[PDB]
Design a protein around this motif. Structure first.
Motif, PDB file in Angstrom:
ATOM      1  N   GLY B  58      45.032  33.160  45.291  1.00  0.00           N
ATOM      2  CA  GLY B  58      43.962  31.797  43.912  1.00  0.00           C
ATOM      3  C   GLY B  58      43.454  32.368  42.791  1.00  0.00           C
ATOM      4  O   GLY B  58      42.337  31.527  42.243  1.00  0.00           O
ATOM      5  N   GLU B  59      44.223  34.072  42.401  1.00  0.00           N
ATOM      6  CA  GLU B  59      43.366  34.277  41.420  1.00  0.00           C
ATOM      7  C   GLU B  59      43.611  33.835  40.490  1.00  0.00           C
ATOM      8  O   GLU B  59      45.108  33.646  39.887  1.00  0.00           O
ATOM      9  CB  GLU B  59      42.704  36.076  41.746  1.00  0.00           C
ATOM     10  N   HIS B  60      42.569  34.196  38.858  1.00  0.00           N
ATOM     11  CA  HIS B  60      43.350  33.975  37.546  1.00  0.00           C
ATOM     12  C   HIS B  60      43.016  35.306  36.741  1.00  0.00           C
ATOM     13  O   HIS B  60      43.471  36.288  36.203  1.00  0.00           O
ATOM     14  CB  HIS B  60      43.268  32.410  37.292  1.00  0.00           C
ATOM     15  N   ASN B  61      41.528  35.061  36.551  1.00  0.00           N
ATOM     16  CA  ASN B  61      41.245  36.238  35.912  1.00  0.00           C
ATOM     17  C   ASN B  61      40.027  37.059  36.283  1.00  0.00           C
ATOM     18  O   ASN B  61      39.771  36.343  37.555  1.00  0.00           O
ATOM     19  CB  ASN B  61      39.797  35.519  34.944  1.00  0.00           C
ATOM     20  N   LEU B  62      40.257  38.576  36.546  1.00  0.00           N
ATOM     21  CA  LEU B  62      39.493  39.296  37.226  1.00  0.00           C
ATOM     22  C   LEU B  62      38.239  39.092  37.033  1.00  0.00           C
ATOM     23  O   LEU B  62      37.826  39.710  38.481  1.00  0.00           O
ATOM     24  CB  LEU B  62      40.339  40.760  37.323  1.00  0.00           C
ATOM     25  N   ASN B  63      37.519  39.244  36.611  1.00  0.00           N
ATOM     26  CA  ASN B  63      36.562  39.259  35.894  1.00  0.00           C
ATOM     27  C   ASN B  63      35.620  38.054  35.551  1.00  0.00           C
ATOM     28  O   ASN B  63      34.122  38.223  35.881  1.00  0.00           O
ATOM     29  CB  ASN B  63      36.108  39.872  34.741  1.00  0.00           C
ATOM     30  N   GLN B  64      36.195  36.673  36.248  1.00  0.00           N
ATOM     31  CA  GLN B  64      35.332  35.306  35.940  1.00  0.00           C
ATOM     32  C   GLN B  64      35.118  34.965  37.406  1.00  0.00           C
ATOM     33  O   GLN B  64      36.756  35.068  37.911  1.00  0.00           O
ATOM     34  CB  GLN B  64      35.154  34.873  34.454  1.00  0.00           C
ATOM     35  N   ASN B  65      34.096  33.921  37.483  1.00  0.00           N
ATOM     36  CA  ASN B  65      34.717  32.591  38.564  1.00  0.00           C
ATOM     37  C   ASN B  65      35.704  31.721  37.997  1.00  0.00           C
ATOM     38  O   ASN B  65      35.317  31.059  36.968  1.00  0.00           O
ATOM     39  CB  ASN B  65      33.847  32.147  39.175  1.00  0.00           C
ATOM     40  N   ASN B  66      36.836  31.803  39.177  1.00  0.00           N
ATOM     41  CA  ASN B  66      38.119  31.200  38.273  1.00  0.00           C
ATOM     42  C   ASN B  66      37.535  29.841  39.173  1.00  0.00           C
ATOM     43  O   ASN B  66      37.673  28.118  38.913  1.00  0.00           O
ATOM     44  CB  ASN B  66      39.204  31.462  38.700  1.00  0.00           C
ATOM     45  N   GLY B  67      36.845  29.201  39.583  1.00  0.00           N
ATOM     46  CA  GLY B  67      36.543  28.338  41.215  1.00  0.00           C
ATOM     47  C   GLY B  67      37.708  27.697  42.213  1.00  0.00           C
ATOM     48  O   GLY B  67      38.118  26.936  42.524  1.00  0.00           O
ATOM     49  N   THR B  68      38.654  29.440  42.261  1.00  0.00           N
ATOM     50  CA  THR B  68      39.649  28.538  43.013  1.00  0.00           C
ATOM     51  C   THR B  68      40.236  29.549  43.881  1.00  0.00           C
ATOM     52  O   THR B  68      40.836  29.581  44.749  1.00  0.00           O
ATOM     53  CB  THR B  68      41.422  27.934  42.053  1.00  0.00           C
ATOM     54  N   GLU B  69      39.271  31.155  43.798  1.00  0.00           N
ATOM     55  CA  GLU B  69      39.785  32.228  44.992  1.00  0.00           C
ATOM     56  C   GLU B  69      39.521  31.915  46.352  1.00  0.00           C
ATOM     57  O   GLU B  69      38.272  31.688  46.647  1.00  0.00           O
ATOM     58  CB  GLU B  69      38.283  33.273  44.489  1.00  0.00           C
ATOM     59  N   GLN B  70      40.199  33.035  47.184  1.00  0.00           N
ATOM     60  CA  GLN B  70      39.895  33.058  48.931  1.00  0.00           C
ATOM     61  C   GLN B  70      39.454  34.327  48.908  1.00  0.00           C
ATOM     62  O   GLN B  70      40.886  34.890  48.189  1.00  0.00           O
ATOM     63  CB  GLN B  70      40.961  31.897  49.413  1.00  0.00           C
TER      64      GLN B  70
HETATM   65 CA   LIG Z   1      38.477  34.846  39.766  1.00  0.00          CA
END
Ligand SMILES: [Ca+2]
Lengths: 4, 240
Positions: B58-70
């Motif tokens: 659920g990652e998109h931007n490695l350096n910012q909180n995307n709100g979807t990661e697990q």
């Molecule tokens: Ca992220």
């Protein structure tokens, strides 16, 4: 070859 | 990915970021494909080191909180029994990771579709490579997932002397080689998504590029051919  | 464009955040929901613990933080090292809620497919060379790994889905931007990661730990690593770290050109660059917990599926987290065993694509089949790898040879990692269109180069052409010659085997897929687009360090282990019968399936696991650089004319990026290992992958998951 280079593993990437 | 050299020559890529930023992917939309819900386009390739099977893509995972494989990261290792580095001091007090985690660093991205390779891509992978989620193939079951608790199993990821990646390259064997990405898991050769004696490091602690974690998987991010659920990652998109490695350096910012995307709100979807697990974030999930890795419980067991199963590398192909014939893999040999000193001979990447021999093939068998594939590995299966059993996750510590099952992830939750949603729009950003889905299973990757695997081809039927033995399937070979026709020359110039439409495929995309995705990853957070370097955006230029000897450059830096991308912060956001990138994608690049990379049509296949069949075995007959790819194994010819002006391309890769004998280095490429029939257990591999070649894609790209236009001198502009390609996988690069940090993309390894990730998917090559190809469109077959209207559906995108994962036909490659990113393995290697040339020693001359990532994007080199007539040195397409080389992937493990997933369809060559369907029996092995099913045998592993069924007994672990
Ligand atoms: Ca992220």
């Amino acid at each position: 070859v280079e593993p990437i | 990915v050299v020559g890529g464009t930023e992917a939309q955040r819900n386009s390739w929901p099977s893509q995972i970021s494989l990261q290792y613990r580095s001091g007090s933080s985690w660093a991205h090292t390779c891509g992978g494909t989620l193939i079951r809620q608790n199993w990821v497919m990646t390259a064997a060379h990405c898991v050769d080191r004696e490091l602690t790994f974690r998987v991010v889905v659920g990652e998109h931007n490695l350096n910012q909180n995307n709100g979807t990661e697990q974030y999930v730990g890795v419980q067991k690593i199963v590398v192909h029994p014939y893999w040999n770290t000193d001979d990447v050109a021999a093939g068998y660059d594939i590995a299966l990771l059993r996750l510590a917990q099952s992830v939750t599926l949603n729009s950003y987290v889905q299973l990757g579709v695997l081809p039927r065993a033995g399937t070979i694509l026709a020359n110039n089949s439409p495929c995309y490579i995705t990853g957070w790898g370097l955006t230029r040879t000897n450059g830096q990692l991308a912060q956001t997932l990138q994608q690049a269109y990379l049509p296949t180069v069949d075995y007959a052409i790819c194994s010819s002397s002006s391309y890769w010659g004998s280095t490429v085997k029939n257990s591999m897929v070649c894609a790209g080689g236009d001198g502009v687009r390609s996988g690069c360090q940090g993309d390894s282990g990730g998917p090559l998504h190809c469109l077959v019968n209207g559906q995108y399936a994962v036909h490659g696991v990113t393995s290697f590029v040339s020693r001359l650089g990532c994007n080199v004319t007539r040195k397409p990026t080389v992937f493990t051919r997933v369809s060559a290992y369907i029996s092995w992958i099913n045998n592993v998951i069924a007994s672990n």
